[PDB]
A and B are shown apart, each in its own frame.
Chain A
Amino acid sequence: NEKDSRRRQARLQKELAEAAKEP
Chain B
Amino acid sequence: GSGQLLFANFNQDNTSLAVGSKSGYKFFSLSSVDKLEQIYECTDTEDVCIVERLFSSSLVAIVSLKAPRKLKVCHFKKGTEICNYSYSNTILAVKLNRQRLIVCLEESLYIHNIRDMKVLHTIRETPPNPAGLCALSINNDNCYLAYPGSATIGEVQVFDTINLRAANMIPAHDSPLAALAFDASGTKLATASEKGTVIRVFSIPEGQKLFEFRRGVKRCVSICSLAFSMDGMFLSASSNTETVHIFKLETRAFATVRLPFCGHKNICSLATIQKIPRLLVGAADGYLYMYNLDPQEGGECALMKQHRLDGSL
Interface residues, chain A, CB within 8 Å of chain B? 9, 12-13, 15-23
Which B residues touch A21, using CB under 8 A? 57-58
- A7–chain B nearest beta-carbon distance, Å: 14
Instruction: Please name 19 pairs of A and B residues whose Cβ atoms are closer than 8 Å in the assembled complex, sorted by A.
Output: A9-B116, A12-B116, A15-B80, A16-B59, A16-B83, A16-B114, A16-B115, A16-B116, A16-B117, A19-B54, A19-B57, A19-B58, A19-B75, A19-B82, A20-B58, A20-B98, A21-B57, A21-B58, A22-B55
User: With the chains together, A17 CA to B73 CA distance in Å?
Assistant: 12
Does B122 belong to the interface (CB within 8 Å)?
A: no
Interface residues, chain B, CB within 8 Å of chain A? 54-59, 73-75, 78, 80, 82-83, 98, 114-117
- A16–chain B nearest beta-carbon distance, Å: 6
A20 touching B57 by the CB < 8 A rule? yes
CB-CB under 8 A for A12 and B117, given A19-B75, A22-B55, A22-B57? yes
**Closest A residue, CB atoms, query B96:** A20
Interface residues of B, dominant DSSP? loop
Q: Top 3 A-B pairs ranked by shortest CB distance?
A: A19-B59, A19-B75, A19-B58
- A11–chain B nearest beta-carbon distance, Å: 9
CB-CB under 8 A for A13 and B75, given A19-B58, A22-B55? no
CB-CB under 8 A for A18 and B75, given A12-B82, A12-B83? yes
A16 touching B57 by the CB < 8 A rule? no
Which A residues touch B83, using CB under 8 A? 12, 15-16
**Closest A residue, CB atoms, query B83:** A12
- B100–chain A nearest beta-carbon distance, Å: 12
- B283–chain A nearest beta-carbon distance, Å: 30
- A21–chain B nearest beta-carbon distance, Å: 6
Interface-central residue, A15, A18, A21, A23, by most chain B CB under 10 Å: A15
Beyond A12-B116, A15-B80, A16-B114, 6 additional pairs, beta carbon < 8 A: A9-B116, A16-B59, A16-B73, A16-B82, A18-B75, A20-B59
